[PDB]
C-alpha cells in the first residue's frame, strides 16, 4: 500500500491549503483515510478521517476549517483547510486508520515571504590536506526558502557513506551541508556530483566537485 | 480531550538489553492503544494495535500490555535498528491523540570523529559570503565539543552546528560545524581551525 500527497508546499497567510492523497493497493471505499500533522517540535495531530461511506469526523481544534473530501472513481482524497496562519506550517500525512500504511510527510510551509532557490557550492579538499584511503567531499546549499531541499549525489547511485544535515535558519533563509566520503582512488577518476532539488521554486542544481585551483 | 503522558522522555540502550516505555491515559481507552515507531527521517510505522496485538512482518521482540488506562511497550533483546521516536495514539475518544514520545537511543563504545575543513569556495567568494565548513563524521557520544580559531584566537561568533540521526548500522552520529563570514572577514585572517574534544584539522587562506 502506497500514499502520493500532492499540492503546495508554500502557501500564503489567510488562504486555503488544498493536499491531495492518492491511493494505491487499497479502496478508498474499505478502511477509512486520513490527515495527521506533524508539528516542527515533534508533536503529532490527528487532523480528521473519511470512513469508506463518506462521512468524516474532524479535529475540533481545527474549528470548521477542515474539509476533508474523496473522490472512490480516482482513489483519491483532500484535504482543505482555511485561512491558514503560520501556526498551520507541518508536516502533512496521509495514513490509513490505524495508520498501518503511512505516506511520506509533505512539509507546508504558510509565509508571506517569497520563495528563493538555494545557491549550492562544491566543498573540494583544501589544496593541502592531508590524504588518506578515503577523501570526503562536501556541497553547501545556502539561502533557500522555503524548507525542503532533496539532496543526492551521482542522482542517487552514490548513496553509501553519504550525510546529510538538518538545515538551520539564518536571516529568514535555510542552509545545510552534505558530506560524501568515497575512496582516495576512486576521485577525481570517477566523478562525484551533488545534485540539489528545490521543489518550491521547480529548480534543480548539479554541481560537479572539482579539485581545487 | 484524552491527553496521553510518555515517560520516559529520552531512554538509552545497549543493544541486547531490554527496555519498556509508559503510556498512560487521562482517561480509559479501553484497549484502544496503537504503538508506533518513527525515525526522524520517514513515516512512523505501526507496531502494536489494540494495546496487544502484533502486526504482520513486526519482529517478536516487540510487544504490548495495558488495559484501561496504563500501558507498556516492552523491546527485549534491543537492536541497533531500535533507534528513534516510539510515540503511542489512542483511537477510543475522538479527536485520536498521540503521546509526546520517547526517545530511544542505542548506546555503544566511544568512537572519535573523523574531521573535514573545508574553505569557502571560490563561487561563494564571489557573492561576499565566506562558510568555513567542517565535518565530524562517525562519533559516539552525540555531545561532541567543537572549538574553531582564527589565526590562534577562539572564535564562537556566526558558528552553527547540526547534527544526523543515529546510524541504523554503527549507531554513530556525525555533525557539521559551520563558521559563517563575510569575505571582507576572511580575508583579513590567514589560518582557520575545527578541533573536536583534541581531534584538528587547519587551513590557511595564502596556500
Ligand atoms: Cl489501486
Ligand atoms: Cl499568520
Ligand atoms: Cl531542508
Ligand atoms: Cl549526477
Ligand atoms: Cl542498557
Ligand atoms: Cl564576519
Ligand atoms: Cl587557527
Known amino acids: 500500500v502506497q500514499f502520493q500527497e500532492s499540492g503546495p508546499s508554500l502557501v500564503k497567510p489567510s488562504q486555503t491549503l488544498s493536499l491531495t492523497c492518492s491511493v494505491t493497493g487499497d479502496s478508498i471505499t474499505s478502511d477509512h483515510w486520513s490527515w495527521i500533522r506533524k508539528f516542527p517540535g515533534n508533536r503529532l495531530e490527528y487532523m480528521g478521517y473519511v470512513s469508506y461511506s463518506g462521512n468524516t469526523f474532524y479535529n475540533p481544534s481545527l474549528k470548521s476549517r477542515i474539509s476533508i473530501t474523496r473522490d472512490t472513481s480516482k482513489n483519491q482524497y483532500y484535504l482543505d483547510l482555511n485561512s491558514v496562519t503560520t501556526e498551520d506550517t507541518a508536516t502533512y500525512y496521509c495514513a490509513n486508520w490505524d495508520g498501518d500504511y503511512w505516506g511520506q510527510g509533505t512539509l507546508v510551509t504558510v509565509s508571506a515571504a517569497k520563495t528563493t532557490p538555494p545557491s549550492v557550492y562544491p566543498l573540494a579538499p583544501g589544496s593541502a590536506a592531508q590524504t588518506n584511503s578515503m577523501v570526503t567531499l562536501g556541497c553547501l546549499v545556502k539561502g533557500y526558502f522555503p524548507e525542503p531541499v532533496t539532496v543526492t549525489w551521482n542522482s542517487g547511485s552514490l548513496s553509501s557513506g553519504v550525510h546529510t544535515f538538518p538545515a538551520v535558519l539564518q536571516s529568514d533563509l535555510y542552509t545545510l551541508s552534505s558530506s560524501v566520503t568515497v575512496p582516495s582512488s576512486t576521485w577525481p577518476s570517477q566523478t562525484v556530483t551533488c545534485n540539489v532539488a528545490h521543489p518550491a521554486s521547480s529548480t534543480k542544481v548539479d554541481k560537479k566537485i572539482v579539485p581545487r585551483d | 480531550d484524552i491527553v496521553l503522558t510518555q515517560s520516559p522522555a529520552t531512554l538509552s540502550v545497549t543493544p541486547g538489553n531490554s527496555v519498556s516505555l509508559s503510556c498512560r491515559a487521562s482517561q480509559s481507552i479501553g484497549n484502544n492503544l496503537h504503538w508506533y515507531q518513527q525515525k526522524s527521517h520517514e513515516s512512523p510505522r505501526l507496531l502494536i494495535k489494540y494495546a496487544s496485538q502484533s502486526i504482520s512482518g513486526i519482529p517478536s521482540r516487540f510487544s504490548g500490555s495495558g488495559s484501561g488506562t496504563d500501558f507498556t511497550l516492552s523491546i527485549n533483546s534491543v537492536e541497533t535498528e531500535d533507534f528513534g521516536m516510539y510515540f503511542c495514539?489512542?483511537?477510543?475518544?475522538?479527536?485520536?491523540?498521540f503521546g509526546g514520545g520517547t526517545k530511544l537511543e542505542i548506546k555503544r563504545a566511544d568512537a572519535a570523529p573523523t574531521v573535514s575543513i573545508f574553505p569557502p569556495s571560490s563561487e561563494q567568494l564571489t557573492s561576499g559570503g565566506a562558510s568555513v565548513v567542517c565535518f565530524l563524521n562517525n562519533f559516539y557520544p552525540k555531545d561532541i565539543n567543537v572549538k574553531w580559531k582564527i589565526d590562534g584566537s577562539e572564535r564562537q561568533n556566526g558558528v552553527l552546528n547540526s547534527w544526523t540521526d543515529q546510524d541504523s548500522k554503527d549507531s554513530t552520529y556525525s555533525m557539521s560545524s559551520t563558521l559563517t563570514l563575510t569575505k571582507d572577514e576572511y580575508e583579513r585572517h590567514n589560518s582557520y581551525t575545527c578541533e573536536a574534544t583534541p581531534i584538528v584539522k587547519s587551513f590557511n587562506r595564502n596556500e
Open positions: 495514539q489512542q483511537s477510543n475518544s475522538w479527536p485520536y491523540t
